[PDB]
Amino acid sequence: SGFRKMAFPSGKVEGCMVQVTCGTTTLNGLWLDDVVYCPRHVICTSEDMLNPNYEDLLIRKSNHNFLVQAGNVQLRVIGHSMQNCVLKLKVDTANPKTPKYKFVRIQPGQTFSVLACYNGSPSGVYQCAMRPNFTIKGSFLNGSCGSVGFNIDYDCVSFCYMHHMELPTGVHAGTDLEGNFYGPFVDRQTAQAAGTDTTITVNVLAWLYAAVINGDRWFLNRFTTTLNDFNLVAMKYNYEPLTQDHVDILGPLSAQTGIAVLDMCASLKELLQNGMNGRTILGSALLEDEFTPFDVVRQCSGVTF
Amino acid sequence: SGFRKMAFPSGKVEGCMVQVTCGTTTLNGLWLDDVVYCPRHVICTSEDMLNPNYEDLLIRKSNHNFLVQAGNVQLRVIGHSMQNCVLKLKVDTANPKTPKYKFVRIQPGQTFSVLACYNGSPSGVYQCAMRPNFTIKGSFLNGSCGSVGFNIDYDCVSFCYMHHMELPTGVHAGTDLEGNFYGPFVDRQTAQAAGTDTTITVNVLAWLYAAVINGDRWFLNRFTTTLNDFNLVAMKYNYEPLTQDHVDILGPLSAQTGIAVLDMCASLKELLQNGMNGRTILGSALLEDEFTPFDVVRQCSGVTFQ
Ligand SMILES: *[C@](O)(C(=O)NCCc1ccccc1)[C@H](C[C@@H]1CCNC1=O)NC(=O)[C@@H]1CCCN1C(=O)OCc1ccccc1
Numbered sequence: 096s097g098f099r100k101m102a103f104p105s106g107k108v109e110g111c112m113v114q115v116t117c118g119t120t121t122l123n124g125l126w127l128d129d130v131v132y133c134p135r136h137v138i139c140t141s142e143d144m145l146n147p148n149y150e151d152l153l154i155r156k157s158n159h160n161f162l163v164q165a166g167n168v169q170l171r172v173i174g175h176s177m178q179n180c181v182l183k184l185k186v187d188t189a190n191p192k193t194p195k196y197k198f199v200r201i202q203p204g205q206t207f208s209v210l211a212c213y214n215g216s217p218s219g220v221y222q223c224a225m226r227p228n229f230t231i232k233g234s235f236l237n238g239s240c241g242s243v244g245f246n247i248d249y250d251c252v253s254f255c256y257m258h259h260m261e262l263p264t265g266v267h268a269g270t271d272l273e274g275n276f277y278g279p280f281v282d283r284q285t286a287q288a289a290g291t292d293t294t295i296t297v298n299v300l301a302w303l304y305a306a307v308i309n310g311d312r313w314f315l316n317r318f319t320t321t322l323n324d325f326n327l328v329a330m331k332y333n334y335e336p337l338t339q340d341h342v343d344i345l346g347p348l349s350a351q352t353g354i355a356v357l358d359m360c361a362s363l364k365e366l367l368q369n370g371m372n373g374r375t376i377l378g379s380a381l382l383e384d385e386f387t388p389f390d391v392v393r394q395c396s397g398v399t400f
Numbered sequence: 401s402g403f404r405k406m407a408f409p410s411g412k413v414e415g416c417m418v419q420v421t422c423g424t425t426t427l428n429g430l431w432l433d434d435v436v437y438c439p440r441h442v443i444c445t446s447e448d449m450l451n452p453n454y455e456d457l458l459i460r461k462s463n464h465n466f467l468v469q470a471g472n473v474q475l476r477v478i479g480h481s482m483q484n485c486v487l488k489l490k491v492d493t494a495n496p497k498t499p500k501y502k503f504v505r506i507q508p509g510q511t512f513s514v515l516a517c518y519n520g521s522p523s524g525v526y527q528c529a530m531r532p533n534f535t536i537k538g539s540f541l542n543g544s545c546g547s548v549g550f551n552i553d554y555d556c557v558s559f560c561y562m563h564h565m566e567l568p569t570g571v572h573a574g575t576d577l578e579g580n581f582y583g584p585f586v587d588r589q590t591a592q593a594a595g596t597d598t599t600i601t602v603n604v605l606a607w608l609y610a611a612v613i614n615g616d617r618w619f620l621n622r623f624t625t626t627l628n629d630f631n632l633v634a635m636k637y638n639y640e641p642l643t644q645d646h647v648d649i650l651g652p653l654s655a656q657t658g659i660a661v662l663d664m665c666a667s668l669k670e671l672l673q674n675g676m677n678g679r680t681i682l683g684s685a686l687l688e689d690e691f692t693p694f695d696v697v698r699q700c701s702g703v704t705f706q
């Protein structure tokens with residue numbers, strides 16, 4: 096028993112991290128097969144970072160302008176191209192540690208593991224969720240750009256995030272591995288506000304199920320409700336709407352606990368209206384919303400990679 | 401910016417995890433060089449778990465009674481020895497993925513990363529702290545025994561924990577890699593229970609410093625305290641005593657923020673008195689005690705956001 100914020104084992108990703116330098120700029124790259132992926136703003140100076148013409152800055156560059164370092168070995172760049180906000184550096188050597196992988200784009204509410212890296216060296220791993228406002232609450236310092244987020248399924252790494260930005264409130268923004276930003280953000284040094292965030296309702300429900308599985312039951316009650324009535328409460332408390340799909344997705348946890356979703360929705364409804372009355376749930380005084388239904392089942396069933 | 405429960409990258413430990421089977425019993429082992437370390441209760445049967453005589457159980461085993469599997473490769477056991485509550489199986493192959501490593505026994509309050517494993521395969525990684533009562537608040541299911549805890553400061557893996565038990569309150573107990581338990585626990589199914597736990601005061605203060613570094617000062621106040629007056633108050637909330645060693649360890653964080661340690665103690669005293677009044681600190685509505693001073697310096701910027 097027990098319930099912890101748990102990240103995927105990071106070893107398959109660690110073997111892919113490299114250092115990329117262009118001029119005085121150094122950040123991290125992802126080395127898969129014979130291509131290194133990194134943020135396109137590696138080609139920028141600070142003057143460029145206000146209003147960068149990435150089109151013109153890249154046609155000025157050549158292969159020799161890029162230094163790629165894998166551990167203590169230099170990788171020779173033999174081609175370069177841009178895809179959206181990502182730079183693709185073709186190198187002369189295929190990464191012998193390349194895992195089975197695919198590039199995926201995740202939806203708000205979904206979670207992933209971040210391997211925070213500096214100068215091509217992994218530093219730490221933690222679990223994040225894509226917020227409804229398309230930011231992530233990460234932990235990133237200067238030099239972390241190019242760090243990636245991922246999920247693992249059996250032996251297959253699904254890369255979903257590359258780090259690019261920190262916003263004025265200290266939350267973070269990035270792209271998928273095809274260089275498309277999550278959220279209404281652009282890669283330049285301008286003030287860009289994260290939109291007002293909301294709470295991920297289906298994940299709060301998933302975490303309440305985890306609490307029941309772990310013996311925390313004080314919030315269960317005799318009442319049930321309907322989607323419509325609950326969604327009016329959700330909107331009142333800046334929670335995301337709950338859809339029938341979310342109810343279906345909570346099936347496995349509803350099957351494991353023998354508690355109906357609209358049953359649990361009535362519990363969450365009262366928690367929002369009355370608070371916790373000085374009690375905690377799974378060691379938290381807040382309603383936690385960065386565990387997905389899949390995250391709960393995987394952790395409570397010991398799934399292995 | 402940001403502040404997260406941050407584990408070490410687990411790859412160096414993943415390459416050491418194997419499956420150990422004896423009889424119908426399977427758990428995890430740690431393969432370093434030509435030795436596989438695992439909990440000695442892998443040799444137990446249903447009856448033997450209340451008062452196992454491990455010396456008598458082990459002398460009856462042959463090397464071929466131990467099946468060690470590294471992924472898809474069977475490792476041949478060529479010898480075995482028991483050290484305290486750990487079994488050491490000599491194998492005929494040295495692990496080519498063995499990292500630079502050492503064994504360290506940690507003190508209560510220290511943190512480490514746990515690589516939770518089942519059947520020799522990693523499931524996930526998370527941060528833990530050794531509680532003052534020598535338990536850890538883990539996430540462990542049947543089959544997780546032999547999973548290990550570690551730090552990797554400066555590219556050297558320091559193994560500090562091997563998982564052996566879940567106690568009736570749902571918390572967890574185990575050994576160092578020399579097989580000595582943390583706390584008063586034993587690898588028997590006889591009634592055991594953890595002592596009353598307490599909050600790791602020096603870690604809470606470290607985390608309040610992290611909050612200041614990241615730009616939050618709402619909880620500070622104009623007062624100070626003596627060390628002894630602080631401990632008289634904090635112990636009324638089941639906080640561990642704060643020692644001069646702890647004050648010294650907090651020095652670098654005090655220097656970076658300009659907040660004297662005993663002035664931060666005065667803030668904590670008021671936070672215990674008042675609660676947070678609807679506010680949060682670094683995203684939490686409770687006072688967090690599983691970040692050490694070292695952890696905060698590891699993760700936070702060296703430049704305070706004034
Ligand atoms: C990230 O770009 C990085 O790690 N940079 C490494 C070194 C470097 C690369 C390119 C150019 C110069 C230097 C960095 C990571 C941030 C910094 C702090 N925490 C993080 O997560 N991200 C950025 O600097 C990005 C690049 C485009 C602009 N930007 C950014 O964060 O803008 C926010 C902003 C800052 C100041 C003023 C206005 C907006």
Ligand SMILES: *[C@](O)(C(=O)NCCc1ccccc1)[C@H](C[C@@H]1CCNC1=O)NC(=O)[C@@H]1CCCN1C(=O)OCc1ccccc1
Pocket residue numbers: 096425426427441442443444449540541542543544545564565566567568572587588589590591592593
């Ligand atoms: C751990 O031993 C394990 O993973 N076992 C897997 C299969 C197996 C191996 C060897 C022998 C038998 C079976 C297991 C992990 C626990 C279970 C649930 N969560 C966990 O972390 N730990 C145990 O079962 C240990 C072994 C010695 C006794 N024990 C235990 O947990 O007993 C609990 C207890 C009962 C009464 C009083 C005090 C403690």
Ligand SMILES: [Cl-]
Pocket residue numbers: 505506507510
């Ligand atoms: Cl220690």
Ligand SMILES: [Cl-]
Pocket residue numbers: 672673674675
């Ligand atoms: Cl109070």
Ligand code: NA
Pocket residue numbers: 315316317318319357358359361362
């Ligand atoms: Na109900």
